[PDB]
């Protein structure tokens, strides 16, 4: 989902990828419902392309002209980060050079 609807690296890519755990900085005892990712999109992204549009997802028969409802959903959903989450469900901090 991250490699298709969010951030895509080209196959002919030169550079480094550096990630480190960041549970200290972005957890909050209550959920850190502030990060968000794109869940629904009608096609794959192109390499090094960025999409920030909301554009309610059709996914049905009714057009849903700008209004959310049945089969029409908001594509951006929030991560739930808590300090008690196990490794693999707690934040990681990524820089790509």
């Amino acid at each position: 989902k991250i490699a298709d609807y969010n951030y895509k690296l080209p196959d002919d890519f030169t550079g480094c990828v550096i990630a480190w755990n960041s549970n200290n900085l972005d957890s909050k005892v209550g959920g850190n419902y502030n990060y968000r990712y794109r869940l629904f999109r009608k096609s794959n992204l192109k390499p090094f392309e960025r999409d920030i549009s909301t554009e309610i997802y059709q996914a049905g028969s009714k057009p849903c002209n700008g209004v959310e409802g049945f089969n029409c959903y908001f594509p951006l959903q929030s991560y739930g980060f808590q300090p008690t989450n196990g490794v693999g469900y707690q934040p990681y901090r990524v820089v790509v050079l």
């Epitope: 028969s61 089969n71 989450n85």
Partner: antibody, heavy 114, light 109 residues
């Protein structure tokens, strides 16, 4: 209204390749994702993957290494290939539209035995 | 891969009563994106509740849903003879789309 009709072999021997095909009538084929879902009495409903008309596929991480999906746009069909089949793949397979929520196929039973 | 757990699968109750089915998840569901499915034997599942509160078009108004966070429940106000089936959860606020386990409602004697 969408009508989904699916067909495929119902008996396989171990280490064979499962092939199923679903055909869509009534609505536009493009602009949607088409999904495959199995159901087994042992565990329950499980989502396998989905594909759109351009050939972009989303796969379940558990079955990412032995699932392939194809699309035939001329005659509005999409097909599933599940390789290295095993006796644990006996289930009922449905073809649905997008996440479901509106339209489902009738579902075909697949049994694997020697 | 959110693991969805559900109320014990077997529960028996007479017709014309209130039926409550509970559902929970390992992680919190974003935007309360939970759906309830009803499946009669030999047929594909059918949608009842989407968004954990709303009702699908053309659905009888004896079905209600309520919940948030990691706890949800479905309520049938009055049981009809054709209201006995298998009920399933579904979360779709996460990329790996997962269902529940299934709860079967019976007629008691």
């Amino acid at each position: 209204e969408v009508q989904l009709q699916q067909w495929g072999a119902g008996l396989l021997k171990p280490s064979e390749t499962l092939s199923l095909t679903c055909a869509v009538y009534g609505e536009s084929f493009s602009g949607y994702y088409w999904s495959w879902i199995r159901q087994s009495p042992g565990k329950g409903l499980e989502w396998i993957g989905q594909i759109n008309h351009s050939g972009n596929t989303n796969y379940n991480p558990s079955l990412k290494s032995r699932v392939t999906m194809s699309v035939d746009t001329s005659k509005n069909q999409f097909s599933l290939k599940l390789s290295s089949v095993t006796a644990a793949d006996t289930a009922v397979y449905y073809c649905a539209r997008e996440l479901g929520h509106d339209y489902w196929g009738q579902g075909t039973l697949v049994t694997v035995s020697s | 891969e959110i693991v969805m757990t559900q109320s014990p699968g077997t529960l028996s109750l007479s017709p014309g009563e209130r039926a409550t089915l509970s559902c929970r998840a390992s992680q919190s569901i974003s935007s309360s994106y939970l759906a309830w499915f009803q499946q009669k034997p030999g047929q594909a599942p059918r949608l009842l509740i989407y968004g954990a509160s709303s009702r699908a078009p053309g659905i009888p108004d004896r079905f209600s849903g309520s919940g948030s966070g990691t706890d949800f429940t479905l309520t049938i106000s009055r049981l009809e003879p054709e209201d006995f089936a298998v009920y399933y959860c579904q979360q779709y606020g996460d990329s790996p789309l997962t269902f529940g386990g299934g709860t079967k409602v019976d007629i008691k004697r």
